[PDB]
């Protein structure tokens, strides 16, 4: 059984000053409609959305940050503009707080349905995204860190030691997810992301391959940064073969969370990459070999409405058990992979 959560209330979050901003309400409705058209919806068990509580938000976020975002619910437009401009790449409407609560709460219910045997795996069609959100601040279209919160929530309804792997294949680095778990060996963060020597958003050297974690988390932060090249299926397949899957298998996760942005997809106006829907199907199919198959796929970014609808639907098709479809690397991609091997071989015996 595959679970699926989609609540149309999360369409309410919008940018009232620029209706052409790519983080569109139709991101989630188009993905959902495509699941109907492909007859995938009726094959899933529908999981209800719910509001995360303020104490659940405190699993990862400060009281001050929670209160500031909560205060926007009744703000006038002039004050929503002011508040949003205080952050890196954030717009806020009165409904933004509700939608962010629903996105986190939807994934909590999905993680719970998985960890209580209700379903094997699940897909969460949620917005706004989360992986750029930090403990104390919003950033890059993200208010609360849905994937990070879900990992801590999953630990809270089972055991703190629950080994959670977060694979972040959104084309952007998940700076918030990295920082939240930077000193933690219970949550393994693996990010693949376009980097371009810091020129790609979020524009921080924190995203480079040499940032491996701190303290007891040393070795449990895996950055796979791309430079100088339009990466696609061969590069992501290779990164999975040489890095993601050997490290994950050695880590032996008990729950896989995919920060599943689809902005590395062919056609995305912000990513510039060319991962195909079949490529995303193969990455999902490989992740399902972990954690007895319990994978929760959480929508992050992705801004080509057609590309994200095809791509995420393909992932659900894989989770439903459908057969994986039929499928030289860019030179810098080998350099990137060899960089991560150099940084991480002292921590993972599977890399030698
Ligand atoms: C870098 N951009 C922001 C951005 C992009 C992607 C993601 C993501 O998908 N993370 O996972 C998060 C982000 F903060 C800026 C810009 C400036 C302008 C108006 C908007 C549309 C376009 C022209 C790019 C925002
Ligand atoms: O009142 C409402 O509708 C929203 C729901 C979350 C908090 N406020
Ligand atoms: K990423
Ligand atoms: K970590
Ligand atoms: Zn992104």
Torsion-angle region of residue 134: left (phi > 0), alpha (psi -120 to 50) or beta?
A: beta
What are 190's strand-pairing partners? 167, 222
Tell me which residue of 207, 212, 204 sits closest to 182, measured CA to CA.
212
Asked whether 196 and 336 are in contact (CB, 8 A), the reply is no
Distance from residue 89's CA to the centre of ligand 5 (Å): 12
Residue 42 CA to residue 45 CA, distance in Å, equals 8
Token pair of 105, please? 């709460």
User: Which residue in 140, 138, 137 sits closest to 89, CA to CA?
Assistant: 140
Helix (H, G, I), strand (E, B) or coil at 107: helix
Breaks in the chain after residues (C–N exceeding 2.5 Å): 327
* CA separation for the pair 122, 242 (Å, rounded): 26
164 three-state secondary structure: strand
Q: Which of 160, 147, 158 is nearest to 112 (CA)?
A: 158
DSSP-derived secondary structure letter, 34: H
Burial of 3 (0-12, 13-18, 19+ CB in 10 A): buried
Atom 8 in ligand 1: residue holding the nearest Cα:
301
Query: Relative to the alpha carbon of 66, which ligand is closest?
Result: 2
Determine the straight-line distance between the first and last CA of the chain, rounded to whole angstroms. Answer: 37
Cis preceding-peptide flag for 45 (omega within 30 of 0): no
Cβ < 6 Å from ligand 1: which residues? 21-22, 89, 129, 132, 140-141, 170, 172, 201, 261, 263, 270, 300-301
Task: Measure the CA–CA gap between 62 and 289, rounded to whole angstroms.
Answer: 35
Asked if 282 is an active-site residue, the reply is no
Counts of helices then strands in the chain (DSSP H, E): 12, 8
- Three-state secondary structure call for residue 298: strand
- Angstrom distance (rounded) from CA 220 to CA 151: 14
Residue showing tokens 């993972």: 348
Name every residue whose Cβ is closer than 8 Å to that of residue 112 and which is 6 or more positions away in sequence: 118, 154, 157
Query: Residue 271's Cα: distance from chain center in Å?
Result: 15
Task: Indicate the annotated binding residues.
Answer: 170, 172, 263
Task: State in Å: Cα 215 to ligand 2 middle.
Answer: 40
Residue 85 in tokens: 């401009």
- Which residues sit opposite 222 in a β-bridge? 190
Q: Which residues' Cβ are closer than 6 Å to ligand 2?
A: 51, 73, 98, 101
- What torsion, rounded to 10 degrees, do the Cα atoms 283, 285, 290, 293 define? 140
Q: Are 270 and 300 in contact (CB under 8 A)?
A: no
Dist. CA 290–CA 168, nearest whole Å:
15
> Which structural technique was applied?
X-ray
Sequence ranges of the domains in the chain: 1-352
* Residue located via tokens 């095809």: 310
**Cα(45)–Cα(316) distance, integer angstroms:** 12
CATH architecture of the domain with range 1-352: 3-Layer(aba) Sandwich (3.40)
158 to 55, 155, 162, 225: CA distances (angstroms)? 17, 5, 7, 33
Which ligand 2 atom sits closest to the C-alpha of 51?
A: 6
Cβ–Cβ under 8 Å, residues 284 and 322:
no
- CA gap 24, 260 in Å, rounded: 17
Residue 50 and residue 42 in contact, taking contact as beta carbons nearer than 8 Å: no
Handedness of CA 272, 277, 278, 284 (dihedral sign): positive
Across the beta sheet with 45-46, the strand order is 45-46, 2-5, 121-124, 295-299, 255-260, 164-168, 187-194, 221-226
Q: List the one residue out of 251, 236, 253, 279 whose CA is nearest residue 351.
A: 251
Residue nearest to atom 24 of ligand 1 (CA): 270
- Rounded-to-integer distance, Cα 187 and Cα 166, Å: 7
Q: How far is CA 105 from CA 68, 71, 189, 253, 319, in A?
A: 19, 19, 21, 22, 21
Output DSSP code: residue 17.
S
Among 61, 131, 132, 193, the one annotated catalytic: 132
Cα dist from 5 to 18, 54, 125, 157, 311, whole Å: 28, 21, 6, 19, 17
Identify the bridge partners of residue 135 per DSSP, sorted by sequence position: none
| Contact (Cβ atoms closer than 8 angstroms) between residue 192 and residue 239 | yes
Q: Contact, 32 vs 153, CB < 8 A?
A: no
Residue by residue, what is the 3-state secondary structure of 245-311?
HHHHHHHCCCEEEEEECCCCECCCCCCCCEECHHHHHHHHHHHCCCHHHCEEEEECCCCCHHHHHHH
Q: What are phi and psi of 108, to 5 degrees?
A: -60, -50
Contacting residues for 85 by C-beta, under 8 A, at least 6 apart: none
Distance 270 CA to ligand 1 centre (A): 7
Residue 228, judged by CB atoms within 10 A of its CB (0-12, 13-18, 19+), counts as middle
Burial (CB count <10 Å: 0-12, 13-18, 19+), residue 284: buried
Place of tokens 């084309």: 171
Encoding tokens for residue 118?
Answer: 């209700």
Using CA atoms, how far residue 337 sits from 41, 189, 237, in Å, is 37, 16, 11
């Amino acid at each position: 059984i595959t679970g699926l959560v989609y609540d149309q209330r999360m369409m309410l979050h919008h940018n009232m000053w620029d209706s052409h901003h790519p983080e569109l309400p139709q991101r989630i409705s188009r993905i959902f409609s495509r699941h109907e058209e492909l007859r995938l919806l009726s094959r899933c068990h529908r999981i209800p959305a719910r509001l995360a509580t303020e104490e659940e938000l405190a699993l990862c976020h400060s009281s001050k940050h929670i209160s500031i975002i909560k205060s926007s619910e009744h703000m006038k437009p002039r004050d929503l503009n002011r508040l949003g401009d205080e952050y890196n790449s954030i717009f806020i409407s009165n409904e933004s707080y509700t939608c962010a609560l629903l996105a986190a709460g939807s994934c909590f219910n999905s993680a719970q349905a998985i960890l209580t045997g209700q379903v094997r795996n699940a897909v969460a069609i949620v917005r706004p995204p989360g992986h750029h959100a930090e403990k104390d601040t919003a950033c890059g279209f993200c208010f609360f860190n849905t994937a990070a919160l879900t990992a801590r929530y999953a630990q809270s309804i089972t055991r703190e030691s629950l080994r959670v792997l977060i694979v972040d294949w959104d084309v952007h680095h998940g700076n918030g997810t990295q920082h939240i778990f930077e000193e933690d060996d219970s949550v393994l963060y693996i990010s693949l992301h376009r980097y371009e020597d810091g020129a790609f958003f979020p524009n921080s050297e924190d995203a480079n391959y040499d940032k491996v974690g701190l303290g007891k988390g040393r070795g449990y932060n895996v950055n796979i940064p791309w430079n100088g090249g339009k990466m696609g299926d061969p590069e992501y397949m290779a990164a999975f073969h040489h890095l993601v899957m050997p490290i994950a298998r050695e880590f032996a996760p008990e729950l896989v969370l995919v920060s599943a942005g689809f902005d590395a997809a062919r056609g995305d106006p912000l990513g510039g990459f060319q991962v195909t829907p079949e490529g995303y199907a193969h990455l999902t199919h490989q992740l399902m070999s972990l954690a007895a198959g319990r994978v929760l796929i959480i929508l992050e970014g992705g801004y080509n409405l057609t590309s994200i609808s095809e791509s995420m639907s393909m992932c659900t098709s894989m989770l439903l058990g459908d057969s994986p479809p039929s499928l030289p690397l860019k030179t810098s991609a080998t350099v990137s992979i060899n960089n991560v091997l150099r940084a991480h071989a002292p921590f993972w015996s599977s890399l030698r």
